[PDB]
Amino acid sequence: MKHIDSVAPGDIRYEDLRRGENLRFVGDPEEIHLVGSAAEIEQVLSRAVRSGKRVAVRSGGHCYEDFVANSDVRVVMDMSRLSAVGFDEERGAFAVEAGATLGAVYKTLFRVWGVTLPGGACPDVGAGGHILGGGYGPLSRMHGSIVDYLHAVEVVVVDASGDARTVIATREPSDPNHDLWWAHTGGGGGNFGVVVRYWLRTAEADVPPEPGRLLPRPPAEVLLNTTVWPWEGLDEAAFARLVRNHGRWFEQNSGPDSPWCDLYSVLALTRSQSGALAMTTQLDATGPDAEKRLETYLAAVSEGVGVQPHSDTRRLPWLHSTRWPGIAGDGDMTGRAKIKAAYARRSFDDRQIGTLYTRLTSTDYDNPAGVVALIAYGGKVNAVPADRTAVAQRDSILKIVYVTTWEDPAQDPVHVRWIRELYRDVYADTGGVPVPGGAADGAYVNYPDVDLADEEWNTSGVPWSELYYKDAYPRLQAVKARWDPRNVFRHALSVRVPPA
Amino acid sequence: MKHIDSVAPGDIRYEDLRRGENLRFVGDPEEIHLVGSAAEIEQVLSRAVRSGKRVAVRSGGHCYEDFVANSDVRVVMDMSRLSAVGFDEERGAFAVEAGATLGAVYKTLFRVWGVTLPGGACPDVGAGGHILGGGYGPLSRMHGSIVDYLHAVEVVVVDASGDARTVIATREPSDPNHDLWWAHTGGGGGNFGVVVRYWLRTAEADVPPEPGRLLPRPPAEVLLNTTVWPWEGLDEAAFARLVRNHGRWFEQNSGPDSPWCDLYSVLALTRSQSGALAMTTQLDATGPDAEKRLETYLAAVSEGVGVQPHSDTRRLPWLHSTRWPGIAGDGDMTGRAKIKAAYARRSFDDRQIGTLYTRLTSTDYDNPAGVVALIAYGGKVNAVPADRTAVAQRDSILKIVYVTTWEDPAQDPVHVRWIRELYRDVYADTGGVPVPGGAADGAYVNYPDVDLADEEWNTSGVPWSELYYKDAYPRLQAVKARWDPRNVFRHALSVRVPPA
Ligand SMILES: *Cc1cc2c(nc3c(=O)[nH]c(=O)nc-3n2C[C@H](O)[C@H](O)[C@H](O)COP(=O)(O)OP(=O)(O)OC[C@H]2O[C@@H](n3cnc4c(N)ncnc43)[C@H](O)[C@@H]2O)c(*)c1C
Ligand SMILES: *Cc1cc2c(nc3c(=O)[nH]c(=O)nc-3n2C[C@H](O)[C@H](O)[C@H](O)COP(=O)(O)OP(=O)(O)OC[C@H]2O[C@@H](n3cnc4c(N)ncnc43)[C@H](O)[C@@H]2O)c(*)c1C
Ligand SMILES: CC1=C[C@H](O)[C@H]2O[C@]1(C)O[C@H]([C@H](C)/C=C(C)/C=C/C(O)=C1\C(=O)CNC1=O)[C@H]2C
Ligand SMILES: CC1=C[C@H](O)[C@H]2O[C@]1(C)O[C@H]([C@H](C)/C=C(C)/C=C/C(O)=C1\C(=O)CNC1=O)[C@H]2C
Ligand SMILES: [Cl-]
Ligand SMILES: [Cl-]
Numbered sequence A, B: 001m002k003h004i005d006s007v008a009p010g011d012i013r014y015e016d017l018r019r020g021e022n023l024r025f026v027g028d029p030e031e032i033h034l035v036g037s038a039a040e041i042e043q044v045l046s047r048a049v050r051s052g053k054r055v056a057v058r059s060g061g062h063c064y065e066d067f068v069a070n071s072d073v074r075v076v077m078d079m080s081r082l083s084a085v086g087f088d089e090e091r092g093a094f095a096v097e098a099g100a101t102l103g104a105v106y107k108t109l110f111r112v113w114g115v116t117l118p119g120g121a122c123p124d125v126g127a128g129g130h131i132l133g134g135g136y137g138p139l140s141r142m143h144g145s146i147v148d149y150l151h152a153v154e155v156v157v158v159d160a161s162g163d164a165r166t167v168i169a170t171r172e173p174s175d176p177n178h179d180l181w182w183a184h185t186g187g188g189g190g191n192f193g194v195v196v197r198y199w200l201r202t203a204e205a206d207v208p209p210e211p212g213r214l215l216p217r218p219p220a221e222v223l224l225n226t227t228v229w230p231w232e233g234l235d236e237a238a239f240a241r242l243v244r245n246h247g248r249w250f251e252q253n254s255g256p257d258s259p260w261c262d263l264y265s266v267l268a269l270t271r272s273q274s275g276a277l278a279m280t281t282q283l284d285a286t287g288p289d290a291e292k293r294l295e296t297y298l299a300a301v302s303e304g305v306g307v308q309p310h311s312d313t314r315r316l317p318w319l320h321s322t323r324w325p326g327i328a329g330d331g332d333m334t335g336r337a338k339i340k341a342a343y344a345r346r347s348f349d350d351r352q353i354g355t356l357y358t359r360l361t362s363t364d365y366d367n368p369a370g371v372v373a374l375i376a377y378g379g380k381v382n383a384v385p386a387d388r389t390a391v392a393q394r395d396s397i398l399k400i401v402y403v404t405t406w407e408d409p410a411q412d413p414v415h416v417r418w419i420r421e422l423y424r425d426v427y428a429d430t431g432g433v434p435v436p437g438g439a440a441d442g443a444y445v446n447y448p449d450v451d452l453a454d455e456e457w458n459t460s461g462v463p464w465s466e467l468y469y470k471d472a473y474p475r476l477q478a479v480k481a482r483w484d485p486r487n488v489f490r491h492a493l494s495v496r497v498p499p500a
């Protein structure tokens, strides 16, 4: 509620709060403000704009790029005190403050009301960045994107005069700020203003005003499988057969009407140095033939592969399953990572598979931790028209995430080069990047990668903005001109109006 | 604050909420109430008391025993809505609600005020059970037990007539409820009443009433080391030298005035099947000669061992370090675990060491996941007289935690036997248990183990109650007679009045 002292170099908290969770980026802000309300954010924004000081907001700190911690940022607004999660009877919707972590969101919504939101897997990700970016995760095939439930958004914006004010923008089409609401359904963090809180509830018409009916219900229990194929004895033809099995399966079973909307999985194509390839799968356990359906899927992936996978399955209550590291991730954010990603509308072709194999088995590189992970997608995501939100990829079947991780900062160039070359080579037919509307559908802004705007790495002539946003981009630039005319909110991949 | 519907079988949340985080114990409650106030706790209690229904409280769900999920328990009070952490200005103390997790506690106190509490490592542990039981963790050597900061407690109690009421008990010796407060400094959960919230504050008399000065400050940054010895290059002689070096060092360097109170480590004596023996160490990074002080410790542990360990050190800001899985644990609460523990006043003698070796190297057992962990302890913990709190062990150098983990419920007897026989054999000279006042100082009630009350496994003639509480037990019994005369709050290891 009340304002408190900001954090400056010298403070015991400075080394923590000058960073997000991505340790590659160490900020030099002069002041970090632990804001407590919309009114305080307005005060912080006005003084900063009067004095010419560059601002950035930190919510959960999960940014894969240096949007918040880059050296030009002088004033951070840290949303840590604004972490409430609750049901706002005033609006008939669930309020999620920007500083709320996904783990607090899922615990509170489910323990208290028996509902959930289909966002990310990672418990520590913050609502602030995640929802704005088009968050998704294990329940997306079943329930769509988290932005599919965005009813309203409270956001502190800066007018042309440099005054800051707070506005509510709603899903109501007659709402005078409806455009700014739209831009929060995937327009991405750091662009338009400071989100204070989001309100979430089903669009559905025919619903009693009871919180327990206003958001999706998760499956009560799920089956959770780990499958591991050892690399020693996995030849190129074995690798390729497993990839192509998996792609075909997702090609045929990711429609919005598929009975497989209740499955989610991540196939990890690891460096052969790791000694094993792995897959994690989750299926709704509450229907009749659940055990069998899981086995059918696993059988499809390993069909004719010629390597016997070690397989184990456990069954867990839903909220418990969310924190199993097989789905949540291993919680270690203390290394250095570089992430790239793409939408896939169809699975890898024979050429891309060959590149994958070469690159993952290569002895030119030394790092067991590089991975290309194929994340189950589509399903109910794809029920939504591509222009209804600012998430324009509504017919994809997988997200593909290329990652490499290491320790020593002296080694940055070597790991960064490995991953740029792998990604370029996989997307070689199309300028080194996943051009929208073909085999791929561009890229996902919650996995930002500044190389998509680098002309050395992107040779497709398709700019970064179209990779992320497709035809959403002109409408996001209209919102930008309207609500952030001074371009107060910006970073290496921020929405920007046309040249004057 | 409003009451909401209780959770009953058939509810989507029942499979999650009938459990804690220990999956070995599955409750059969008839109703789980998500209480939101003292007032609502009173109603729920006094209606159970009128019906004769057995109650239990759930906060963090981390109980290592079946105290909450025992099949006799009929009505659970789940504290999840009572999760606030903040500074209570009127009382001049930090208020932590019983449902708050230790990660929310550390994030709030540190980011907002730059202070902390020396409680547990694990971020998902609940305040409710942890503080009551005598919580400690990586900063205990520096700052004592979390109970050394308990200033007041708000607890709902049941009187002889069966009426529920809420009382506030403080650290002021003339408080009529002072002994109730005292029982909450280590008495253990599930014994006296329902804790709504704790109030925490330094005992120092100097201190100006400002929140940033009323709890201890953590070190701004720490060094964190992971040292690993491969099992394949370890003979019994090497093993024993290692354990002896470690024990001697802890013997010499754990007094309340030691320069080494800023060091914490965990030595993991793992089954040799695991391929590696490991030690995680944390040291304050901020004072002169930090790196070299760390080095002289790691060198002391390895001295004359004849096996060079893999040793890497990272430096991290303090709040970030709390979430590194090396200190925090790996977050996986699925599967099945049995935990035993002991206080250590001196390190293992030669015969105990040979026992450890035999049992960790045995091929009569098949489990890589068995470990004996030696956790740094003492330091400022040991500046408090043994009788000032219900934590009676105030001269120990180490906690020793014995663990085995597995998957299949049909193997329960085998793993339970293994860990039972290990612990008995280590404590063979004292009836198979760590009898207080000698080489050991009993056991720690936050690591409960019902076997300590089992004549088949405890043949020492020292009862369970004396192992946990030493000469604190009579004062704890008086508190039980005075505040829980009906014995509403009970479990397999609950404080019990003398037979009449
Ligand atoms: C590290 C990490 C990221 C994950 C993980 N799992 C995900 C998943 O299963 N599904 C996903 O869709 N995404 C996953 N992600 C990625 C996260 O979704 C993105 O990393 C989010 O953008 C992160 O959000 P947040 O934690 O809030 O990150 P910040 O660095 O604070 O902000 C990112 C970006 O957004 C701007 N921004 C923050 N807060 C605000 C507010 N209130 N208003 C406007 N703009 C805001 C920031 O300035 C920054 O530009 C799993 C893991 C382990
Ligand atoms: C699983 C787990 C436990 C840990 C971990 N790390 C620890 C550490 O680093 N240091 C420690 O000292 N302890 C560690 N522990 C153990 C925890 O301290 C104990 O397991 C705590 O007892 C757990 O507390 P909580 O999470 O609240 O567990 P519950 O199961 O809800 O309760 C335990 C016990 O206490 C009673 N009780 C709960 N809440 C109340 C209230 N409000 N009032 C009275 N009594 C209460 C319960 O009924 C039950 O009897 C690391 C990990 C991973
Ligand atoms: C399923 C997930 C969805 C989320 O979108 C993110 O979360 C999950 C669990 O996995 C995704 C991906 C496969 C794994 C990554 C990036 C690994 C990251 C990693 O090891 C590290 C870091 O990021 C920093 N230090 C590190 O060591 C990632 C994009
Ligand atoms: C330093 C710690 C202090 C805490 O007091 C607890 O945390 C820390 C990190 O370590 C302690 C101990 C070594 C480890 C244990 C019990 C492992 C548990 C474990 O693997 C499992 C479970 O408990 C359930 N499933 C599982 O797989 C434990 C008691
Ligand atoms: Cl949808
Ligand atoms: Cl209350």
Ligand SMILES: [Cl-]
Pocket (backbone or CB within 6 Å): B122, B123, B124, B125, B328, B329, B331
């Ligand atoms: Cl935890």
Ligand SMILES: [Cl-]
Pocket (backbone or CB within 6 Å): B021, B124, B125, B333
């Ligand atoms: Cl947990």
Ligand SMILES: [Cl-]
Pocket (backbone or CB within 6 Å): B491, B492, B493, B494, B495, B496
């Ligand atoms: Cl008893």
Ligand SMILES: [Mg+2]
Pocket (backbone or CB within 6 Å): A323, B124, B333
């Ligand atoms: Mg958990």
Ligand SMILES: [Mg+2]
Pocket (backbone or CB within 6 Å): A332, A335, A405
């Ligand atoms: Mg990693």
Ligand SMILES: [Mg+2]
Pocket (backbone or CB within 6 Å): A021, A124, A333, B323
């Ligand atoms: Mg974290």
Ligand SMILES: [Mg+2]
Pocket (backbone or CB within 6 Å): B332, B405
């Ligand atoms: Mg484990």
